[PDB]
Design a protein around this nucleic acid. Sequence first.
DNA 1: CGCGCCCAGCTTCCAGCTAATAAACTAAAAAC
DNA 2: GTTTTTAGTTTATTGGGCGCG
Lengths: 490, 534, 7
Amino acid sequence: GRDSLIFLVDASKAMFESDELTPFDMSIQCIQSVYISKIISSDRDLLAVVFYGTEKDKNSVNFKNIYVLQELDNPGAKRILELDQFKGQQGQKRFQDMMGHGSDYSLSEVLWVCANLFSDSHKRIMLFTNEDNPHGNDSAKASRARTKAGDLRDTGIFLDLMHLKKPGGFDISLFYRDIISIAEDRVHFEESSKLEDLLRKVRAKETRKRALSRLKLKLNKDIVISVGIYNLVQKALKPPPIKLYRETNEPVKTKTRTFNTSTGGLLLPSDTKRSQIYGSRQIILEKEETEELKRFDDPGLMLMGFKPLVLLKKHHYLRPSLFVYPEESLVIGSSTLFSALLIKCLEKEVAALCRYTPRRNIPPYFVALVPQEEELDDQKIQVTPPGFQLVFLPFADDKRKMPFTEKIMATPEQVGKMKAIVEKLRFTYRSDSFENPVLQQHFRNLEALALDLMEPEQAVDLTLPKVEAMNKRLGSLVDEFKELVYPPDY
Amino acid sequence: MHHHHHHHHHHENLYFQGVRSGNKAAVVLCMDVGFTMSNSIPGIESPFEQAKKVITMFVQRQVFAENKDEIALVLFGTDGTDNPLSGGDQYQNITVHRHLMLPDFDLLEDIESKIQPGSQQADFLDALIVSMDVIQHETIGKKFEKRHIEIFTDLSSRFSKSQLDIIIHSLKKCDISLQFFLPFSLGGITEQQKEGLEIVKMVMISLEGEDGLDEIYSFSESLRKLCVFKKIERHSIHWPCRLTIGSNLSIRIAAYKSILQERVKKTWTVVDAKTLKKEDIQKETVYCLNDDDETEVLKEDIIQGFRYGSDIVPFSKVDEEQMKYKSEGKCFSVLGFCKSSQVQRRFFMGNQVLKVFAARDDEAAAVALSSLIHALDDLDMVAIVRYAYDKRANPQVGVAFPHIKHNYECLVYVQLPFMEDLRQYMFSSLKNSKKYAPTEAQLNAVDALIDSMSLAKKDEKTDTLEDLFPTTKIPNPRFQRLFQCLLHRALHPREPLPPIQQHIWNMLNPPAEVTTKSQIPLSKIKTLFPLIEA
Amino acid sequence: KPRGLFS
DNA sequence: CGCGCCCAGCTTCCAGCTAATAAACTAAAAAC
DNA sequence: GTTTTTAGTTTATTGGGCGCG
């Protein structure tokens, strides 16, 4: 039930060679990020930190030039603090003096140490290096590494390469082509040169997809394909508090029971009924009946027809959209029909309208399956997955009437002044640009308490406008706009 | 958007005023139960039965509706006489069946079983006088925002035209609005019906003016409108704030919720199967240790803590209160502007949509905001803003995009995601897929299916597409269904729950035309696309 | 706006 | 400046009236 | 069995005068 991820870092001379961070610093910072994110999301995965090419060795079999900094275990405050000691130029000096660097290694021995950590769900090894063909000089080592790499793949251990920038480029075909595990259908990410790219590439391979529900998409009663529903967006919430025992700080289990006030005896679900008062009468239903009145259809997506995308209003948002992807494991032939529907919906700029029932005993909702074409960026990272955007449509009850206002329009001169202001404060929006101030502060607070620092780090609010910079960038445009709109007396 | 008559007080939060004030209304249903109301044409239902169904539909809607509106029922053409204005030779054959009280299941039961057609005939204008008396003598005690009188008659009987002036004067002075419900539409009746209709027309024109004629309905059209339960309507609270661009430019704005996942406030109360009382039920949450033998703990020994991965961090609500991130307060601050293309609808977050207008009756703010709206529209751009409801609410990052329509312009606000909420998961490509590529024939079958199953129609001569299936106009079936059941259990406690009403299923299904057209294309798809469970 | 019986 | 503490409008004296709103909460469904 | 997540609740607060520390 707990997946395992081992971060394997190269400590060769080139890893500490550059403005831009060294591939090593980039790796350390990337690992810390995963550690922190795994905490923010209360992830139960086990993390490990291993280094190779070091002068010092900390492996169980005393293999030369391999250092197991952190064994496979749940991330915590101390482990994050430990990784921070190797961050930056000062950290680079601390690492080299603590363990050494540029020492000769043997990838076969390195992989043995890693595999052994798993032995002591999903087993994954993430390698950070800017060295392609490290055993080019020693055929005996290169051959042993391939055999060991092959044995890991046969065992079920996934080996992913996080190749970092090297002068002339990093060539996968030279070595690692016969090491990395391929799930099969170019399909490989480009070399990382920026921390941001390394982070996304790592986090992309790290977390596995989790279906919110596996449902049937009914074209009609007879033609049924299987689909997976995925969230793609999930409200980042402050972890709920946990009850502890004052004297031992040990977590406490909580049982909520229901009993008759008079008798004091435990109440079975069959010992209670459901009530609602209307008019001047008490209306009694059984628990079974309160569920029955909620039932319409059966769980799934029932095709209603096709509605052109122009008829779907942007302001008719109700709740976050879901993602629909074919599930070949349930109904064979689902992906072919899905692909055809996707290809044609895109071509015709049309959406598939459906009556959606997420679970048993739930009223239906109208949804628009919006065709979504695949998109990869410069680094070959999947920005947009191919499939359908499940867009929830509001019922008449969900819409709210707006109060009356007379339409007052601005002059071309005023619109022009505002256009100049809009152009001045133009920027490139990216969905990953802002951090939740509340969450960030909450965990900075927990860090100070878990490590007994007594000083909480203060999070920098990225959501606050860069007021001073904006004012300087606008200059007199503000005073100009004001003179054209606002009266001297207000 | 609302009518110009709908005041803004309905949208503002005040101490037992505005949204918090009771929109209580007094309604007197004035029904004709006279001999002629029972006379019917072979093909159609009697006016009595038609009017009876309209009244039942009205009362049923009101019983489940949130409103504290009070209802009285006056009957005329009854055998006996029972009204406050009863004289030896005056206001005869007129009965006040129900006095102004909140509607209940006892009223509905009387309408369905106790009320019987009369053998006599009464003056409908006299019945209106009795109805006015009910409002005049019963609205004094309570606070009613509105007073209505609904008359259901066939206009078959003779009436006195002598009290017209007092009728009109009292309706105007007491601010009582009128409505007529007849067996026929206004836009083969007897001569008496033609006379009665002219007077009804005159009355309505005197009270409402030219528009008065619009307040005369057929039972047929009334039954059509009232067949469904009341659609949930709530007034959104106006949210005052200032849209800030830097620290020197401020725009006074008023925001309102346009979209919500609407719910019924009243839910199921768990009660004892015997007493049917809530007080007989009690929940006690007990605490025990993770270690063996289930060791109980007293509330005086439990502290608050949080998990930081493997670490367990004790953190009291007192310490958490002070170290807690504290927002400056209410805000709507522009961070910058970007291409609308950079903001994808798949990233829309939250449980609401905010429509942002300029502060009420502020022309300066209106012009200023109109400048922003049109500039963004003309530049195909959007605003990225920091939104915080109040000093307590967690601050949000969101999009504010232009919305220009006829009679109104505004910015639409929707929350955008934080880095911490974005799982991109990395899905397998389907285009590269050499195994699941559809054939030419398969693609043509889907192409034919999409054309047959089109939910839209072009060539309206306005270059506008007509939607054949408008989902946003349909009321949420769960409420309609719940009320149908709640009503059924109230009037028939021994009977099991009824099945879903056909009209409900009819409104949830696409036009029969769409279903018919798709049959052949669907058949072609079933043969071309092999489908089998693993 | 719809009035009376319809409101 | 920033906390807290009252009163706040409506009914021919005053005591109970009202309802959207966001965060916090439980309980259960489904994936795992 | 377990966690993850959401559907479905309950519950406190709501505005703007005034005074003090």
